[PDB]
Structures are given as structure tokens and as C-alpha cells.
Design a protein around this motif. Structure first.
Motif, short mmCIF file in Angstrom:
data_model
loop_
_atom_site.label_atom_id
_atom_site.label_comp_id
_atom_site.label_asym_id
_atom_site.label_seq_id
_atom_site.Cartn_x
_atom_site.Cartn_y
_atom_site.Cartn_z
N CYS A 186 0.83 -1.18 0.00
CA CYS A 186 0.00 0.00 0.00
C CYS A 186 0.87 1.24 0.00
CB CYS A 186 -0.93 0.01 1.23
SG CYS A 186 -1.88 1.55 1.34
N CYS A 230 -0.47 3.85 6.49
CA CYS A 230 -1.29 2.66 6.59
C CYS A 230 -0.79 1.72 7.67
CB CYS A 230 -1.30 1.91 5.26
SG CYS A 230 -2.31 0.43 5.31
N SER A 261 -0.79 -1.30 7.67
CA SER A 261 -0.20 -2.52 7.13
C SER A 261 1.32 -2.58 7.10
CB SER A 261 -0.71 -2.81 5.72
OG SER A 261 -0.35 -1.79 4.82
N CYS A 275 -7.14 -0.51 -0.46
CA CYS A 275 -6.58 -1.25 0.65
C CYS A 275 -7.63 -1.63 1.67
CB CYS A 275 -5.46 -0.47 1.33
SG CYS A 275 -4.66 -1.40 2.71
N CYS A 308 -6.48 0.61 5.27
CA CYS A 308 -6.77 2.03 5.35
C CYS A 308 -7.94 2.46 4.48
CB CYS A 308 -5.52 2.86 5.00
SG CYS A 308 -4.96 2.73 3.28
ZN LIG Z 1 -3.44 0.79 3.12
#
Ligand SMILES: [Zn+2]
Ligand SMILES: Nc1ccn([C@@H]2O[C@H](COP(=O)(O)OP(=O)(O)OP(=O)(O)O)[C@@H](O)[C@H]2O)c(=O)n1
Ligand SMILES: Nc1ccn([C@@H]2O[C@H](COP(=O)(O)OP(=O)(O)OP(=O)(O)O)[C@@H](O)[C@H]2O)c(=O)n1
Ligand SMILES: [Zn+2]
Lengths: 152, 310, 152, 310, 310, 310
Positions: free
Chosen positions: C108, C113, C115, C137, C140
Motif C-alpha cells: 500500500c 497505513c 499494514s 486497501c 486504510c
Molecule cells: Zn493501506
């Protein structure tokens, strides 16, 4: 080593990385960006070898390696055999010698080394010793066992 | 041109025995005969990415003693040239288009070396790069030893304190190991022992060294007793207390010291050297610091002038 | 099976991905770890297709691909063909269909984010917008042109 | 006396085309013929109420290259001359009774202008005042353009990045708009477009400008490709990612660039210019920075000496 | 009343084997049959002079699961009672007039024992005092070992990491040493070896223990592999890099492990346990953390409820 | 069980029209007939990785009004679990072994969804995750719109301020878009316009929306005027000054308003709503904040009480 089942055709001019200790092939191709070329390439992953069970093999065309680029394979495929070829003939055949300097591919283990956040290429002095290879970073001057540097 | 003209000064491992003698010979001359105008019109950058008042003042003073101008900064909680984003490489590519030489101290190992790759023709002098090198501290230490002992060969050198982490003692040991017949005494808690790699280097050159529990065991024969600061912040309060006791130097310990014997310490001290040692003829840590001026002047002069009519 | 006028190789059983565009072969073996398998894998890169000029090609022994895994190949190499080869005879020629969910291989682009610093697998929502596939995503919930996501 | 003798240097809007040529002509001369003693005995204050390492080092170096002494400070989390209470007016009334000229950078717009109202006869040079002006950055940029292109007229100038907030591009556009036949290419996300007031100024003087989605569209004709930093802290992480992609310059984009073409960037860069651009003949951002020295020396010399026998 | 009624809980050394067993048995009972009103109307002070979100939350959840009310504070970056001005003694003297028990964590060794001398009839439970004790972490570790191994005797226990400074592995060792036939395996870098006093303690009790370079040497015979965080600041970055491998765990290292072996870690792990270990039946660090509530509930129950109606 | 029993509450996009209605109906019931013992014996974690006093207090009051116990923390300027060392994943893994539900606010987008993958059977309610979602603020907004307008369909809704970055106006829009016949009026400076993706969403649903320069253009026909804070740091001070008038409200701007029109603002207002608006029958931002407790209570009730005995 041959294969009485299905042998991959030879080529006129190029190089042949034989005896690649399987599961080191692709890595060689990553580490050294061997596929970032237009020349014809031919890979053989996990193959039959009476002198070591299994082995990978890379063939790159119209491309050759100096004794040094060949020495750079040392740490990964030390018992490999680089084959210089022309007019379909194996005109040259060298083996990886331990170099005195390894650049760009290793990553310094020292998290405080300046090399990490910066636009520079890693560089290590190579020094052989009983049981391992001692690698000393050009920047931080710390020396590490190759098992730590190569350490995944 | 002299052998150090336009050369970078990054690591003691890059300097030869002759390089070292050349720096110390120039130092004695500038000390005896000042050239306050040698570097007039030269501008030097004093870049302390890592704040270090004692080292910077020493280095800046040396600059002025030769007549050069200085520009620079300290720490990076104030600075807006790398605090978060711009690479050290870019910071150097810029600064090297302004100045004649860069003096720099940095928290990461290898920063001075990285700087030489981006400073073009501007010499980089390493005032310390993390736990790696501190070459001018080593040059000042060696100038002090040579000056008080008259030689750098065949000396009995004792090193005390935190030998494990002190970049200063590692460096001085390597430098002295470039000379002949030197013998070392290492006195340190096992938790802070002189590292095996340094001991290997020594064995390899046939240099004698031996560990000792107290200074007492070496005092009668020592020429240079080099004391280091114990990095307490690294240890346990209880631990640091339990051993500090046997690595603290008191005036009474100098009882059987040779007349030529000198006590050195890169400073700051605090719990390693009692104040009563200051009045004895052996205390030479403040004289050691004053020598950083002559050592650093020498290095600047050698690197910026082709031939010194010193 | 890869013949012109000399030696040629083939696999007993396993799958065979054909017609991968320019230097996407290495990337596919990279992303999808097609070589993590210690079977007899064989690769051809910059090969002479004639019906294009060049292309890459893979082949795995004792390995099969679900119509699913064959879908993740649409973003880097749309038109191609994976082939299951049991008994030296390709018993199946499928095609990579654009999927709804791309996991683990994308990153991402939103730096904030959650992640990034975490033990999770990336996950996006596929949705073409007049050729400029948009990626959303899972964490987010932000959406980016596939050009931005793939850039890195 | 020269036209800039004892004048304040606060805004590009206060400088005429001749003023600009005078500064650049003096710069080339000092660059070719250094006068390391021109300002000996002059003391200059380097007042960075707003810390800015790159600009201060550049300005201080220029001061020393002309032989002047410097005194000053940076930031105000350390300073005790305005941290909370004393007006900038009083700080200037005091400092101007000590020095021959004041170089200052400040966080609020208009601070340099306010300073001239309290410095009596001491010239004030604006090293940046919030989002308003940064005249010496503009002078250095113009010196670099003139020097690499040989002129300031009839140029194709492309500006990339955050044109909305960059005080540096607004200023350079205004300065260039004082010359003839210049044409502008603005490449920026719509969220960071070059402001309408600048476009109005341009239309009003009959200067051609046009917006473009990528550098690609202008590369064949550009003389100066001026890249700016994108103020990320202003945008959304997701937003900044979504567009940054089309305002990043890579070495491959210089494929069809003219031989005379130069890439500039006031720095620091990071995500706007890939490192591979550094080795091409077009990268001129570090040369641009080194020119700040000659531009700033010129400005100091012109303002402090009546006639320059340069 | 029960043996622990109204008793302080400062050090594992003040707790007998029977005490440890009484806490674990009580903890087993509460886990099985909750009693949400047991300490209804009790008010507990959760005093974290030293912040510790994980430990504070665990403890406060245990107070609530028994129905007690809670008052408190975290991180004393200052605090007008117990650090910057007022003595800890006065802070407790005051706090003991408000609550029924005090749970406290402090950065100085002995803090909890000192509180005990000023809290009158108010029990004090030590949530951590410098590098000294952390009683409830050990009760949670033992309850976790007893529950997954069926016992606390004749066990093969490996401890890995910073055995030198980890107060937690020191206490677990002492506690396990009060039981019989436990065999210990200590895996740590030499710079962080299990202290000599712990080893001596074990020798007198005639308990077997050995040192090993890495996990694999003992992996096939351990019942409990207790991992600890190696504080990165302890070591030099390069030193840390040269030695960390020998002290981190991946699931592939588990091929030899006994089906009954559990991996514990007081948390945070991150540098020592890879996340692939998470899915194995051996990972039990989260269940261990979960057990902290049952051990902590047991303790509050026992100390505050005269007749523990189990 | 009810439809939301044991369900996570991460994004308004995962909530259906029926879900939204179920929460509002439940909230209406609790407001009318309180149930202070409903979650007696439940223990909730109030985890504010990102501090937010207003939101945290609102949420904790709702936990207490249902009789649940609360454990937690605010602002993680560090935290030894979820930012500086330990992954958020491990923090939740641990925290989910202690409590019955987790309410969390975090500075990174997706934080709450990630927690959901490590909390096992423990429900997670998103109190705010970066610029992504803020579900409970929207439930409180809708309950507030439904209660003062009798419905959530065929409404004329104006949104003012920073429509570009306000995660709150983005969610309210999406939620209102799940109902029918809602008409939207977007009043914002061009630099802060409602995002294109929100507009596209509306086009597909065939919902009507228009753009306007200021409130007065639509004041006479709005049922709800939802004001948002224009973060001063977003814009340049002068830019902020040139545009703020078009986005602030005074009571004199209310002469056209429908008797039923209410002004909402998620707070803080200050720069956008003058205090003279406070006394009008249109001001409803404080009653809106008050409704946060009924919406938040509803949510905890539904997610934690299998059979919601309404
Ligand atoms: Zn993301
Ligand atoms: N035109 C050619 C010529 C040689 N090769 C390869 O180069 C290597 C040479 O093998 P060979 O000369 O027959 O020696 P070996 O028997 O393989 O012993 P060694 O592997 O140590 O060389 C083989 O992989 C062979 O297939 C090739 O692929 N194409
Ligand atoms: N035992 C086998 C059999 C086939 N193949 C490969 O299968 C691929 C596809 O062959 P096939 O689809 O059967 O005929 P094509 O001419 O490839 O059909 P197309 O024109 O669509 O490619 C070829 O690379 C062939 O070498 C293989 O690697 N091993
Ligand atoms: Zn390194």
C-alpha cells in the motif's frame, strides 16, 4: 552432468553457470540482476547431478564474466563452473575463487552503519579463515562472519 | 607536497607509522613556532552532527591558531540540514562547495568515510563516527606520549577502565601496535574486557600484553597509565558500584611510579581519577588536552598546505 | 518441447506457464515465489516467440495451479496460459482471469497505513476504471491507481 | 557609490532589472577574482530567529570569504533575546548598535522589513521571512541561470512540484518576469498549482505560460527545469503518494533534453530527484548551492562598499 | 484467615513453596469459577511511578474482575508525591489512608519494601521495583508452567536471552528452585550470562544446570523454553548483530521439541520470537499473559479476603 | 442474538441501513429507559493510542452508564505495546486476553481492522483510525439528525468547512447516502473541496448534490447545517484569512433558516461558529455531543448483550 531424458540446447556465444547448488540459482539471478538484459537466457532449477544430488544451471547469451564477476559467485555457488562458450564450443571454463572484495550485494549487519540510509553501495573486504569468511564493512570498519552477513 | 596534503583523515587503520611521525613532528614545530597566518583565507566547516563541546572547541581553536575562519553547527535538535529527510550525502555535496575542509563528528559509524565520497576535492577530517574511529584523539594521545617519553617504541602502557567499549583505547592500541617492543597491561572488569579482536591483532604481531586485577601490579613498570571513562549508563547501578572500586586511581597509588610515568585520560573523568592525583607530577590529562591543539593544528596544516616551511 | 533444430527438454508432470511479456518472467518468479518449490523447474527468458519476438516462460514439475492462483497473474501479464502436464500431455490450457482480491504481493502506497509495520498480508480490492485499475486497501480503505501501487 | 550601497535587501519586488544584473555581474567578478580582505574589520550579524543550517552556513561562508567577522545565533528554544517578551523592534535597535550589517531569517512575514525601521543606518539582508520573501535564494538561482545559459531573456523555464506554497518559485517567477521573452511551464498537482496572482502578473506583462501534466511534455524545449520540494507535511499521506509519482524526476526523463538544459532545486530534495540524475551533465543543484556563496558575497560587498574596484 | 491474608507481596524470596502453591491453586479456582463480587467495596490504588501499560492493565483488569474499585496514576515524569519533592515514604503514608491495598511499580530497587514500612495495615503488592523483584510476573509464569506441564517439579527448563539483567528470569529461577528435581538450561551470550549468585544458589540446593550456545543443543528435551528480550541498548549495535542469532526463535527451530513443550516470553518479543512461531502449539506467550489476570486475581483475593471461600 | 451481537464496528461502510437503524432505535430506548446494570461485570478496554479527551470521556461515560468496568490508557507518546517496539498486533493479542471488548483510537488508518485480526472473540469498536473511519461519531450524528428531523430520508443537508480532509463528513455522507432522497449542499473553499470519490459515489446512487460559495445561498432550505473545523495548519495564514469568512457562522446568518433547521458540529468549533449562535434554537452541537453517550451505549449494548431486551 548430462540428462538422458531432456537436454537443453546449447548456444553459440554466451556463458553457462553449471553446478549451481539448487535453490541458489534464482538467488544468483536476483542478487546479481542477471535477468536485467535482453539477451536470451535459459534457467534450470533443481536438477539431477551425480556429483551432488541436485543443482541449478543458468545460461546467458552473448554475455561473459571477468574472472572477478565469476569470483563474486564464490559465496553462493563456490563449486560452480562458469563456462565461456563460442561457436558452440566450451572455449573457456573457470571456477569461483574467493574474492578480496564483495560489493553491492551484501547488507551490513551493523544497524548503526551509515550505509543503510544512504545512496552508496555496500562494500566488504573478504578475508578467509578456518571455518568461515570474515567480512569487514568499508564504512563502519566492523568485521563479521559471513554467516552473520549472509544471515537471512 | 607532504604525504598528507589533500588527504582525508578518517581512520587510524589508514595511517602508517610514517604518517603518524609526520603529524607529531609537525605538531612539535607548530608548538615551538606558531604560524598564525598559515591558513588565512581558508574557511573550514566544523560539523558536529553529534554535539561534542570539548572536541569542537579544541578543533575550532586549532583552526583559529592557524588563521582560518570557521562556520558550522552542533547537534541536530536545532539543525535543519538532516534532522529528518535529507541524506548525509546531500548535506556533504552542498557543504563541500562552500568550504576548504570539513571537520565532522557523527553518531553513525562510517559517516566520515561516506562524506569523502561526496566532498570531491575537500578533505574530510573525522572528529568521531559512532563507535568506530576518533583519529585526532589518537594523534593527540600519541603526541602526548612521544613528548613526555621521547619515543613511541619500547614502552610499558597500561590501559584502565572500560576497554570493551572505549573507541579511544582500541585506536590507541592499534596505533601503538605500529611501533616496536611496546608492552600492554589491561586492567578491566571482565564485563568490560579489551575485545578479543584487539588481542588477536596483538598476538599476530608478536606484541606482549597481559591482564591484571589492579594497577598495583603494574605501577613500578608503567610509562603511560591510560585511564578511560567507565560507561556507567551501560551497566547496572549495583554492578558499576561493585567493580568501579578497583579501577579508580588515587594519589597514594602513585607511590612507586617511575619518574617518567604519566597518567592520561581522554576525559571527562569523575570516578576514575581522584582530584588528589591532580597535583602530582604524574597527572598529565589536562596537558594531554592542551596537546589536542597542536595535534589538530598539524593535521590541518599538513592537509591544506603542500609544503610546510615549518 | 522447446525445439528449433537441436536438444530440447520437457517435464513429466507439473504445470507450465507460457507467453509472459518482456521481463515479467523474473518478476513473476519473484512475486509469486514460483521457484520456492524444489521440483524440476525450468525457465526461458527473452525467448524467440516469433509470434511477438520475445517472451518469458516457466514450468514446474509435480506442481499444479488452481484457476485461482492463475488469476493473480493478470496485473503484470494479462494474456498468457498456464498448462497442467500430467503424462507428458498437457491435460489443460486455462487463462488468468482478473481477480477481485490481490493479497501479499502489493504494498500500500499510503505511508501511514497500519499494514506497513505489521505481521499482516496486504490486501486490495480490484476495480478497473476505463483502463487504470483502481486498488483499495483493506486496511486504510484508501484507493489508488494500479500505476501508483505497482510503482513500488 | 554603487546603487546598492547601504541599501536594505528585503524583497525581490524592490529590486529592478539593473539591480539584479549588478548583483550578478559582481558575483561573476568575485567568483573569478576573490577579494578576501574587502570587508576586513566589518562585523556582521547572522540572526537566524528561524534555524536554517544550509542558508546560514552559505551566508556565513560568504561573509568570511570577504574577510568579515560574524556573531549571531539560531533558533529560539535556546536564545534569550525574544523567546517570550522582548519585541523584534527592540532586539534590532540593540543589535544594530553592535554590527555593520544584519543578515536575518524569521518565521513571520515582514520581519526583515520591520527590522529596517529600527536598524538606523545598518543594512538589513532578508534570509527569509515566513512565506513572503527569500531574495538571496532568488539571486543565487538567477546567477546560476545566467551563468549556465548566458542570459536571463528568452528562456524556456519549467517549474515543478509545490508551486502553491514555495516562496522560492514565486520569487524566481517575479524576478524572471522582469526580463523579456521568457516562457514558463508549470507542472504541479492541481492541489498545489501556481497561484492565480502570479498568473495574473504574467498575463499582465504579456508573458506566456502554460500548465502541463508531466515534464515529458516540455523536456525537448526546456532550458531550466526548476524542481521544488513538495511540502508533504501539508498533504495527506495517501494524497501525497497518489500524485508525487508524476513530479519525481528520473535520469531516463532527461533523454531528449537540450545540451544546455539544467536541473535546479533549492534543496533539500528527496523524492523529487532520483540519485541517478546526479551523474548526468544536467544535474546542477549542487553547483546552484555553491553559487549562493558568490551571490551572497556580491550582495554584502555592494551594500557595504561604495565602489567596487572589482 | 488464609496464610496470605493482609500480607505484603514484595519478593519471591519471601514466598514459600506452600505460598506459591496456595496462589496457584486459588488462581485455578477463580479461572474455573469467577467471583465478580468478591472484593466489592474494596478500593485499590494502582500506582505506577514507573509506567507499564501491559502490567498496569493486567493488574487493573484483575481488580475489576473481582469487583474492586480502582484509583491511580502512571508514569511519574514528576509527580508531587514520590520523586521530585515528597519522599516516597510520605506518598505512601498519605495513599495508605485512602485505599485498601496498594499495587505499585517503581524505578528504584526496594521501593515496595519501603512502602510496606509506611502503609500501616494496607497491604502492598510489588508490580516491579527496579532490577530487583517482579513477584506477580513470576506467579503468572509458574501458574503457566504448572497448568501446561501438570507440575512444577522434575521439569527441564531452558531460559534464553539476557539472563544477566532480566529480573524476571532471576525470580523464576529462584521460584522453580523451591521445588524439586528441576533441571536448568541457560542459553545466553557471554556478555549476558546468568549471574554467579544464581548459579551458586542452585549449587547449594544441588540443582542441575548447564550452559549452551544455542537452543538446538537442548531443544529436544525441554518442557519449557522461556525467552527474554535482549535490550538492544545493552549491547553495541555490531555486538548485538554478531550474537542475536543464537538467541532468537523461528518455527523451523521447533522440529525437535517435545509435544508438551511450551514457549513463554514475558513480552514484548519482537527481536527474539519470529511471528511464524505464533501458530505452533508450542507458542504460549499470549496464553501466559492471559494467565496474569488469574494469578493477579488470586493474589488480591488472598491478601484482601480473610477467609478465601474457594 | 441481535444482528450486531459480538460484531466488530470498524467502518460505516460495513454497516447496513438496517444496522444503522437498529443502533438508533436501541439508542432511543436507552435514552428513554436507562439500564445501568446491563453490562454489569463486563470489562472494557478504552485504548487511546491517539489521545482524544472528548471522545474517550464520551465513550467511558457510556460504559459506566451501562455498568461496565473500564481499564485503559491515552496518548501513546511511546507505549511499550503498539508503537515504539511491540507491534499493534501483539498489543491487541495481549489486551484481548484481559477484556470483553476493546474501544480504540489510533493515528494510523486501518488500525482497528488490524486489531480485529488479533482480538479473537473480543469485539473491537473503532473510535477513530487516522483519516479513515470514525463510526461512532457518525452514529451520533445520524441519531442526532433522526431525532430532530423525525427521519433520515428526503433531507436537505449542508456540509461546510474542510470537506476535503474531514473523515467525519466523508462518513456522514456515506451513511446518509444509504437512505433515500437526501439532497446535499457542499460549501467549502476550493482548496478543501469534497473529494471526487465521494461525489462519484453519490452520482451512482443518483443522489443530488451541488457546490456553493457560502451558507446564505442555501440557508433558507436546509434541514441540517453540519459545520466542520477548518484546521488552521492546513492552509497558509493569509490563505486562511482570505477564505474563512465563507465558512464561519454568526446568528445573523440565520434569518432565513427553517424553523426545523439544526446546526451540528463535531467540535471543537471556535473558528467557525460564533458564540452568539449558541442561544438560537438552531444550535444543537452540544445536544449532539450529549447524544454521543446514547449512541455509544447502544453500540456497546448491542455488541455485548446477546439478546438485547429493548
Ligand atoms: Zn493501506
Ligand atoms: N554450447 C554449449 C556448450 C556447453 N554448454 C554447457 O556447459 C556445461 C559444460 O559441461 P561439460 O563441458 O560437458 O563438462 P561436465 O561434464 O559438465 O563437467 P563440469 O560440469 O565440471 O564442467 C554444460 O552445462 C553444457 O551443457 C551449453 O549449455 N551450451
Ligand atoms: N511435457 C510437456 C509438454 C508441453 N510443454 C509445453 O507446453 C507449452 C504449450 O504447448 P501447446 O499449448 O500444447 O501447443 P502451443 O503451440 O503452445 O499452443 P499455443 O500456440 O497457444 O502456445 C509449450 O511451451 C510446450 O513446450 C512442456 O513444457 N512439457
Ligand atoms: Zn557497516
Amino acid at each position: 552432468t548430462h540428462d538422458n531424458k531432456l537436454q537443453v540446447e546449447a548456444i553459440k556465444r554466451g556463458t553457462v553457470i553449471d553446478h549451481i547448488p539448487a535453490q541458489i540459482g534464482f538467488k544468483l539471478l536476483s542478487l546479481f540482476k542477471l535477468t536485467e538484459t535482453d539477451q536470451r537466457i535459459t534457467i534450470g532449477l533443481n536438477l539431477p547431478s551425480g556429483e551432488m544430488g541436485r543443482k541449478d544451471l543458468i545460461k546467458i547469451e552473448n554475455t561473459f564474466l571477468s574472472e572477478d564477476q565469476v569470483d563474486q559467485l564464490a559465496l553462493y555457488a563456490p563449486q560452480a563452473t562458469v563456462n565461456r562458450i563460442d561457436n558452440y564450443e566450451v572455449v573457456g571454463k573457470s571456477r569461483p575463487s574467493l574474492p578480496e572484495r564483495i560489493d553491492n550485494v551484501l547488507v551490513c549487519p551493523n544497524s548503526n552503519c551509515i550505509s543503510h540510509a544512504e545512496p552508496v553501495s555496500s562494500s566488504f573486504a573478504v578475508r578467509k579463515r578456518a571455518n568461515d569468511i570474515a567480512l569487514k564493512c568499508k564504512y563502519c570498519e566492523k568485521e563479521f562472519s559471513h554467516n552473520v552477513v549472509l544471515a537471512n | 607536497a607532504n604525504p598528507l596534503y589533500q588527504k582525508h583523515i578518517i581512520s587510524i587503520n589508514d595511517l602508517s607509522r610514517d604518517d603518524l611521525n609526520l603529524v607529531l613532528a609537525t605538531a612539535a614545530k607548530l608548538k615551538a613556532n606558531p604560524q598564525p597566518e598559515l591558513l588565512k583565507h581558508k574557511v573550514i566547516a566544523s560539523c558536529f552532527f553529534e554535539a561534542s563541546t570539548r572536541t569542537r572547541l579544541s578543533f575550532e581553536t586549532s583552526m583559529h591558531r592557524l588563521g582560518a575562519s570557521v562556520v558550522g553547527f552542533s547537534d541536530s535538535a536545532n539543525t535543519s540540514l538532516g534532522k529528518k529527510g535529507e541524506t548525509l550525502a546531500d548535506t556533504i555535496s552542498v557543504i563541500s562547495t562552500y568550504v576548504d575542509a570539513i571537520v565532522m563528528r557523527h553518531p553513525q559509524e562510517g559517516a566520515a568515510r561516506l562524506a569523502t565520497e561526496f566532498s570531491g576535492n575537500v578533505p574530510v577530517l573525522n572528529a568521531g563516527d559512532g563507535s568506530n574511529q576518533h583519529p585526532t584523539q589518537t594523534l593527540l594521545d600519541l603526541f602526548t606520549i612521544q613528548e613526555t617519553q621521547g619515543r613511541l617504541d619500547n614502552l610499558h602502557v597500561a590501559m584502565v577502565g572500560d576497554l570493551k567499549y572505549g573507541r579511544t583505547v582500541h585506536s590507541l592500541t592499534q596505533a601503538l601496535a605500529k611501533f616496536d617492543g611496546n608492552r600492554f597491561y589491561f586492567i578491566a572488569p571482565d564485563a568490560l574486557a579489551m575485545p578479543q579482536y584487539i588481542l588477536d591483532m596483538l598476538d599476530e604481531k608478536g606484541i606482549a600484553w597481559s591482564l591484571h586485577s589492579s594497577i598495583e601490579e603494574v605501577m613500578a613498570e608503567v610509562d603511560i597509565l591510560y585511564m578511560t571513562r567507565v560507561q556507567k549508563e551501560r551497566l547496572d547501578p549495583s554492578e558499576y558500584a561493585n567493580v568501579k572500586a578497583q579501577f579508580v586511581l588515587r594519589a597514594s597509588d602513585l607511590h612507586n611510579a617511575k619518574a617518567n610515568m604519566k597518567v592520561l585520560h581522554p576525559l571527562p573523568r569523575v570516578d576514575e581519577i581522584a582530584t588528589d592525583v591532580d597535583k602530582t607530577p604524574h597527572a598529565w590529562y589536562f596537558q594531554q588536552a592542551g596537546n589536542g591543539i597542536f595535534a589538530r593544528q598539524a593535521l590541518l596544516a599538513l592537509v591544506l598546505n603542500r609544503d610546510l616551511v615549518l
